[PDB]
Point group: D2
Chain length 392, copies 4
């Protein structure tokens, strides 16, 4: 299988660039030059790169340095044909953000966090980025009495509303994507799941400019079904971006290669994004890999792992396609009545009164007889895995 | 401390009435008579009782029978002074609901599911109930290819829009509270967390009529912070009802007495609900205990466990109040800047243009200096714990 | 592929016979006749059947009735050529066992539990069973003060020593396998993981007669690595039996078909068992499926699901074989140094004296240079999954 | 209350010295001077201090330096009266240990790891330490095909056997305590639970010299009942040491103050360790706090947090004693038959022959009447909690 720009695979500079300094040890790899990252990624088949302001320009660089770095980065994209579909801001690393950016209890930190972001929005706009991703990693708490969640939500909203105002006024045309995470690094992070993030966005001033950027491992950290969660994000039309990676349930954030965690869910996810209505994908944005090359690898291991992500996604797509094209699958789908859920429960123009008058919907209904027919779901599931396994 | 009608403790008929038949064993208790339950609940301090249709009137009772039970039931209510704040429908027990009620792949079960609920709405209306709780326990799947999540949400919405229509035409004045649960009985249930339920509700035709009924244990089954999710629900103004109980993290649904599982989170929850805005509670609805007397107990144990629920709440309330009234806590709160979060990040009339002009919010900001001061959150947490243990 | 008797696939009478009454609903299937179950299993390729005393002979059957059932059973066995490799006793269903069998706080229940088991050993011995599995599903607690664990382990050991005694005296030649489970039905079950069971077994009077019967989902309920725990059980030589099924991390006991939960862990499990040292399997007992046909299925889904367990094992087996015979996989193994772990760390005859004397082990050790070499683990993982996917 | 040296509260140098560099951000605190630490801890009530080789002497310190540091360290101990009850070695930080120390695939690393430990054993012996704690934080894997678990256990055994040998020959008199942890930093760590660790120890050459050092948060990361695990560890006589802290279930290793995570389980643990048989504590070793002052804190929060660990243990101790001394508790314990578990199931001199001859244990036993009586566990639990809240 081969990756095309139409596949839209993107990588964050902080992914292949992760030096592997974890909570219990020192870095095992040297620093990756952004320019080299651009050439390597272009080479393995990626169509775009993303970055945190501090990933490209070292926190605290003068404008001379800053400017110089942007210029070279810009050349590299130029020469390679890579685009920057999204940019983000680092509101978690520096000690000042120890209690959050936008929701720090310290008012001065909150004003500073907004400024840091406006600036990144400027660069984003100049590089042609269309989405600003906001990961509130430090927004939350370790102790219940330390954070007033209501006030917190008011301040998160306040900051976001200003950001959309600016973008709209400067005409940047950006879309905002809130990234939910349940915990790590805070004991508990605000807006813990795709559901909480979606509900919150619905309360902003210009909600149409906001969506979510859910990450595979983030929902799996709470043992939730990532595919089902994405399906709901799609139903709401808030899937603005997506971070793909692997995780093995509730434990620290693993950030494994996509499909190296819950493989069955990785399969159902590709199927959902790709086998959309009418052949066409159900999702159109970047297929972004927010993962980390294991601490035990060297740069060889690093590039290997970058390609494994693309590879996993294309192998899965291929099997998802074959699955759906299989007449035996088509027959099992029919037997399990999966498409019957698409037919409205009520007849055309039928209301409460017509339903109340329908004796077959209750008075004359044989629940015991209907309760005994099987749905044939194990069989359909078995067909799916055989396709995944390449046994069909 | 003793319970008042003002405390608003309510219990489901099915809590104290649970025969303790579990997934691996026979019932260890005999059936509890409803008139009896009303009488015993009235005696321990409950102000109201709730029930699923099938808890009161056995599935399939002829009208004479059904009519007879209701009459007896109403008389018990009458005599004890107990009310029916909420009613619900059993859409999970009968085999016909094995793939869901509103979102079953089978269209006829969907139609019957609506009829069974309309009928319950009429009785609830008749008893004076103000809330209809909907727990979609059979909505979800075991395998991803078995359920079209999108179609399932359309059908969940189609059914609720109809229920609101009927309630409104008829003048019943009901409020609808959706109850989220991540799993059990289904592998994965649709609308798994408080967030997912709130996001969904915002998409119905008359959203103002819809809220959620979150359960302590359900959020804990995903290892989420229950108090923090209630804080967000209150922020959205969607906390229409609450189900209190205890649980020990992610494992089957335990349904312990409130406060017998995560005690620290039980404490922060009572503080949130009672030490509200003015001085006044932040939540005014029923404090409903959705628990189960452990299988190892007889009826003395059942009545002991019912009183334990009320005792845990009043004991926690008492300490929450004491916590907030302590000068040392006030001092700790001031050092942690909890209240500073309530002050807008921006000065009145300040926008991005003024923020951008403030050199001190960025260009001259000493982030290193700010990042070095502590928040003193451990100390605040320790004071809270000492109040809970009655150590101060 | 097709299963052979050499495959040693067995099923418990209670798996295909599960009537699907869960914690929230009635049964969706009628009862399966044991003779019929014998015939059907034989037909799908099983080599044996197992059962709890109460699965075959209804609790409280008079001796004439019990004798009759046993006789018809034996005939079916005879006629089909199926064997009974293991038997077990139900010490969890009847209300009497609500606080456990061997470890109930009530002395009389402990005496009756032992008699119930002795009677099953007789029947097992007569059907030719070689293993007696002990699943103490009710041994545990919901509250810490309710159970003295130390006393409980003493009582557990007391019962198990008597059982070995009787067996050895009767010349039954049985081996005992304790089956660990973390929770469900008790809040916390004693001997929660394979580890705890092994450590306990080591304290019996005749440890050589005791091992464990670990179950895939049971270890996954604690989010532990099943294959890795199995590897350790094999190092201790205590894998007497195994229960294969599927689970999705920490939540109620799902009992899915083997391979329908954690697919990647199912794959590495089959690699461990069959591609043992010296060509041959590392384990030679029954491959027992302790699963449940989903509640959504009828008898067709039931047989479908029994066959899916066998297909799943055979497909993974084929892929594990191909994986290991791949010269590229071999080269990756060499590069990752997997086999180098099998070489003693100390040289032959080397002791601490010589090690202390070797300056290349410390004094002249270049930690920094070794620390920089990659192990190539990601690439190895990628070939593994490419084999499972049938992409190689 | 006040801490005495008989309480035996000890702390690791890395606890109060944690600079708060997490997986996502920089250190928020400057480095702690070891002499100061000795002084500070002496002041809050600690009776001893512990450390990893590398906590005290910077990795790669010349002999001169090393010697220099130790000498100052011994002075501080001298001056203050603190002892070093236990010592440990860092086999997780330096990049060379990325695949483990003792079970690294790389043989040269295994040799180096051994050397590094020998050296710390010497320093330990010289400082008067009685226990060597071994935490194999890097022992495990991220991918199943990368680690032969059996060979890894062989190599782990091989290294421990040698250490015992050396200690015995040098006459050091050390006991060794293996510390289990399920994950972090490796995806899966070898010897994931107290269970697994005990089973392993039993396979060593001089098992009487080995035990375990379970940590509260480690067992809670897999959602196990810490108290029950320590009860088993005491049953086996393998509780050589204990690490006390707090955790909020399955998520990253939090390291909160003891009792700041699962408060009810911290209560039952204190009760188990102190309200041992013959009035006396069931455990007589160090009560060691392996925790971390939250990243949001400064040095004041650091000493605050140190004192909190002591305050929590002593407040809990005080309630555990009141609980056991309460007559109504005594009445509840009797009704729950907690002590009847201590009376052997069989009468003195009874074996299977006499048990078989007892019609009352089976043939004439009324399981139904026994099964109808409740154990009063809920009431007993409620009394325990009211004692903890200081409500009784
Ligand atoms: O768990 C960390 C998180 O995934 C981070 O990598 C974000 O995705 C980023 O800050 C915005 O893309
Ligand atoms: O998981 C059980 C669930 O909590 C159920 O008891 C609902 O709460 C009820 O059907 C609506 O109140
Ligand atoms: O969770 C239930 C457990 O798995 C049970 O099915 C045992 O396996 C059996 O009683 C002994 O084989
Ligand atoms: O998870 C970290 C681990 O607990 C470490 O702090 C050890 O306990 C130490 O290596 C020996 O005490
Ligand atoms: Mg991400
Ligand atoms: Mg509920
Ligand atoms: Mg089993
Ligand atoms: Mg520790």
């Amino acid at each position: 299988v081969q990756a095309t720009r139409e596949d839209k695979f993107s990588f964050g500079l902080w992914t292949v660039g992760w030096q592997a300094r974890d909570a219990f040890g020192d870095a095992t790899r040297t620093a990756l030059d952004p320019v080299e990252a651009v050439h390597k990624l272009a080479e393995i088949g990626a169509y775009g790169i993303t970055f945190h302001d501090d990933d490209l320009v070292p926190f605290g660089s003068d404008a001379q340095t800053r400017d110089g770095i942007i210029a070279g980065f810009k050349k590299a994209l130029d020469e390679t044909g890579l685009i920057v579909p999204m940019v983000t801001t680092n509101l978690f690393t520096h000690p000042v953000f120890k209690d959050g950016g936008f929701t720090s209890n310290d008012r001065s930190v909150r004003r500073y966090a907004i400024r840091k972001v406006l600036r990144q929005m400027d660069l984003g706009a100049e590089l042609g980025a269309k989405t600003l991703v906001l990961w509130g990693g430090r927004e939350g708490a370790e102790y219940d009495s330390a954070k007033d969640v209501s006030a917190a939500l008011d301040r998160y909203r306040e900051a976001l509303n200003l950001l959309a105002q600016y973008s709209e006024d400067r005409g940047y045309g950006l879309r905002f994507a809130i990234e939910p995470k349940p915990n790590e690094p805070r004991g508990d992070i605000l807006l813990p799941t795709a559901g909480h993030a979606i509900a919150f966005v619905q309360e902003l001033e210009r909600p149409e400019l906001f969506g979510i950027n859910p990450e595979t491992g983030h929902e799996q950290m709470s043992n939730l079904n990532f595919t089902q969660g994405i399906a709901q994000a799609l139903w709401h039309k808030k899937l603005f971006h997506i971070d793909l990676n692997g995780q093995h349930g509730p434990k620290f954030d693993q950030d494994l290669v996509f499909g190296h965690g819950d493989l069955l869910n990785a399969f159902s996810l590709v199927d959902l994004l790709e086998n959309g209505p009418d052949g066409a994908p159900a999702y159109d944005g970047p297929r972004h890999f927010d993962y980390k090359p294991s601490r035990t690898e060297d740069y060889d291991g690093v590039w290997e792992s970058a390609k494994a992500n693309i590879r996993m996604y294309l192998l899965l797509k291929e099997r998802a396609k074959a699955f759906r094209a299989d007449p035996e699958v088509q027959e099992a789908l029919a037997a399990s009545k999966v498409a019957e859920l698409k037919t409205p429960t009520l007849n055309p123009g039928e209301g409460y009164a017509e339903l109340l008058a329908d004796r077959s919907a209750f008075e004359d209904y044989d629940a015991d007889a209907v309760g005994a027919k099987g749905f044939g779901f194990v069989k359909l599931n078995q067909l799916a895995i055989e396709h995944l396994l390449g046994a069909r």
